[PDB]
Amino acid sequence: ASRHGQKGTIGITYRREDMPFTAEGIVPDLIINPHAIPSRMTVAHLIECLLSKVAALSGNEGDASPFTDITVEGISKLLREHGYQSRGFEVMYNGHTGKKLMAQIFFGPTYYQRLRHMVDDKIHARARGPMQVLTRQPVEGRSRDGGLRFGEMERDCMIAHGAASFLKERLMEASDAFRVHICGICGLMTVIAKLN
C-alpha cells in the first residue's frame, strides 16, 4: 500500500523485458490501475509522486508536510527544470512490441508499504481431518487444519438455488452424519444396539 489508503495485492509479476519502458530505459517496479483514483479522491498520492520525482532528480528531500504553501504548480515548475513534462507524464513504449503507447504514463517514485497478510500464511484447504470431540464436527482454524464454516447465510443461498441434495451432502457427508437406532414405540434413542 501507498500512504493514502491504497490496499493492493500483486496480480502478476513481469520481468524487465515485458514491462513498459521509458526512452531513458526506466521501468516500473509497480503498476497501479488508473481506476483506483477518481472514486477514492486520494490526490495527495498523485502529488506525492510528483514531489518524490523532483526529490530523486534534485537529490533533496520532498516537503510533504500538510499546512504549507507547497503547490502542485510550484513542484511542476522544478520537474520541468529537469526536462520532464511538468505533470508527471512520460512517453512509454510497450515491452512486448517496442511500440510507443498512444497514452503517456504518469510515472515516478512513490513510497509503498509491504504489509502483513501474505497468501502463503493464509492458504488453507481441508478434505477430511481433525474432528471436534463433542460436536463430532470439523475443527476450527488453518492452524488446527480446520473445516471452513458453511454458515446459515450459505445454507440460505443453497435453498434459493434449489439444490436440496448439495445442501444435504454439505451437512451430512462433509461434517456430522451419524447412525442411530430408534424404538418404533417410544421413538427415542434408547435401543441397545448390540451389532454383530
Binding site: 520481468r15 524487465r16 526536462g83
Partner: protein, 263 residues
C-alpha cells in the same frame, strides 16, 4: 553492408550510443529484449556458509553475493551445469570463490568483492574475477564486521540468463527512442495549452527533420531508425552486449528452423 545499419554516436567502456537505421521495430525491440533477458553470464548460484558472526543473515549475505558482477568474457567456454555430466559441479561448468573476513581492527572492517578469491581451476579463460570499477579498487561492499565478527563462505558461480534471475543480466538499462517528432503519430500528447511547449524536445530531435505543418500526414511511413543506448554492468564489455545480443537472437531463430527439419 546489405540490410540493418549502424552509426555509433558515443562509445565507452560501459555505454554505447548508436542508431539502428534500416531496421524493423520488431527486430529493434526483440534485440532490446534479448539484451535484457537472454545473454548468458557468470553469477554466484550457491553459498555454503561455514561462519557467520555478522549483523546480517546468511541468505541476506548469500543474496548480495549473487548480485556481485563476475567476469563473463569467456562464458561460452564454460558449460551450463545442467548439461555437464558431472555429479553437481566442476571446472567445466562452474567457478569457485572463497570469502574469509574477520574483524581484525577495533574499527569497522569492510568486506568487498575484492576479498572474494578464486579457488577453482580456471583453465586459462577470462572468467569469474569480480568486476571492479570503484576508483579505490575494492569493488562492491558485501558486508561490515565489528571485532569477534567473522565470515567464512564458499561460492559456486554458474552460467545463466536474466530470464531465470536478474543477477544474470549483463546490462543495466537500455535507452530506446524512435520518431522524436511524432511524425508517425504513435503517441497522442496529453496537454493543457500547447503539446509542443509542455513536452520537452527530444535529444534525438537534432538527428531528424521537423514535421513541417504545410504537409499532409504521412500515412504510409513505417518506424525505422532507432536511437539506442546500451549500458553494461561490466561482466561483459558493451560491444559484446550488442554482438552477443544479436547472436543469442540469431541462435534462437535458428533453433526453430532446426526444429522444423527435426519434426
Amino acid at each position: 553492408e546489405e540490410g540493418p545499419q549502424v552509426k555509433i554516436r558515443e562509445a565507452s567502456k560501459d555505454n554505447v550510443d548508436f542508431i539502428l537505421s534500416n531496421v524493423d521495430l520488431a527486430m529493434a525491440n526483440s534485440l532490446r529484449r534479448v539484451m535484457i533477458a537472454e545473454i548468458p553470464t557468470l553469477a554466484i548460484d550457491s553459498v555454503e556458509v561455514e561462519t557467520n558472526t555478522t549483523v546480517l543473515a546468511d541468505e541476506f549475505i548469500a543474496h548480495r553475493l549473487g548480485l556481485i558482477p563476475l567476469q563473463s568474457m569467456d562464458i561460452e567456454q564454460l558449460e551450463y551445469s545442467r548439461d555437464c555430466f558431472c555429479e553437481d559441479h566442476c571446472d567445466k561448468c562452474s567457478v569457485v570463490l572463497t570469502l574469509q573476513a574477520f574483524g581484525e581492527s577495533e574499527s569497522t572492517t569492510n568486506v568487498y568483492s575484492k576479498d572474494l578469491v578464486i579457488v577453482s581451476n580456471l583453465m586459462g579463460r577470462n572468467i569469474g574475477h569480480p568486476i571492479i570499477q570503484d576508483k579505490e579498487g575494492n569493488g562492491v561492499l558485501i558486508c561490515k564486521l565489528r571485532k569477534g565478527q567473522e565470515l567464512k563462505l564458499t561460492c559456486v558461480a554458474k552460467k545463466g540468463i536474466a530470464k531465470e534471475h536478474a543477477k544474470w543480466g549483463p546490462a543495466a538499462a537500455i535507452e530506446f527512442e524512435y520518431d522524436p517528432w511524432n511524425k508517425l503519430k504513435h503517441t497522442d500528447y496529453w496537454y493543457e495549452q500547447d503539446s509542443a511547449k509542455e513536452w520537452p524536445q527530444s535529444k534525438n530531435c537534432e538527428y531528424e527533420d521537423p514535421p513541417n505543418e504545410g504537409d499532409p500526414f504521412d500515412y504510409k511511413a513505417q518506424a525505422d531508425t532507432f536511437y539506442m543506448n546500451v549500458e553494461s554492468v561490466g561482466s561483459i564489455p558493451v560491444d559484446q552486449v550488442v554482438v552477443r545480443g544479436i547472436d543469442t537472437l540469431q541462435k534462437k531463430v535458428a533453433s526453430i528452423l532446426l526444429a522444423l527439419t527435426q519434426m
